[PDB]
């Protein structure tokens, strides 16, 4: 009953990001996948989009430029491949963590594992987009 659950290889370049990377997640189309993360995940095979999601947050945990902007609690989360918690004001009910979003929707032929088609969003911003 899904497309996100079909295996595929990660592609795409991502974009340079700074300390406000995750601040960008609650705005516009969301924040890009960092070029630094894209370099690490390119050409790796993933069994589902969720496995890709886990890999993104594990790479964030391992990247000093990205992880330095998460507090000790959020560091513990990303170390486990969990998505980090957003600020309270960007949460919506039980959706409390950053969500990966497909800029061109998969339901519309958008690429599942092309990082240039992926954005990091807060729950509030993601819901508003859709």
């Amino acid at each position: 009953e899904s497309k996100r659950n079909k295996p595929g290889k990660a592609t795409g370049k991502g974009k340079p990001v700074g300390d406000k990377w995750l601040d960008d997640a609650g705005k516009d189309s969301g924040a890009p996948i960092p070029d630094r993360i894209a370099d690490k995940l390119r050409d790796k095979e993933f069994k589902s989009f969720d496995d890709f999601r886990k890999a993104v947050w594990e790479e964030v945990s391992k990247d000093p430029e990205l992880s330095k902007n998460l507090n000790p609690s959020n560091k513990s989360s990303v170390s486990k491949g969990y998505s980090p918690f957003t600020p309270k004001n960007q949460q919506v009910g039980g959706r409390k963590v950053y969500e990966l979003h497909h800029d061109k929707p998969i339901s519309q032929g958008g690429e599942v594992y092309d990082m240039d088609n992926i954005r990091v969003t807060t729950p509030k911003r993601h819901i508003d987009i859709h």
Partner: protein, 82 residues
């Protein structure tokens, strides 16, 4: 565990420690704990106490417990068991 007065301070510290260390079998489990934490403390900052401390706030498990303890004391709320 229906309210924070059901917790001794030491029990509450265990909850907070679990959350801070992401010491769960799934993200779903962790999110549920965080929700429970917010329901217990009744603090306006919610999960920000754990993940987005205000400048100067101690976001270690003991620091978070103290903040909660002091806030509840200062704002007319019941405290920990014992």
């Amino acid at each position: 565990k229906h309210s924070i007065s059901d917790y001794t301070e030491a029990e509450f510290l265990q909850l907070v420690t679990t959350i801070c260390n992401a010491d769960t079998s799934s993200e779903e489990e962790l999110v549920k704990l965080v929700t429970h934490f917010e329901e217990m403390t009744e603090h306006p900052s919610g999960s920000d106490l754990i993940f987005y401390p205000k400048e100067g706030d101690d976001d270690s498990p003991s620091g978070i417990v103290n903040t909660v303890k002091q806030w509840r004391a200062a704002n007319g709320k019941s405290g920990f068991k014992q």
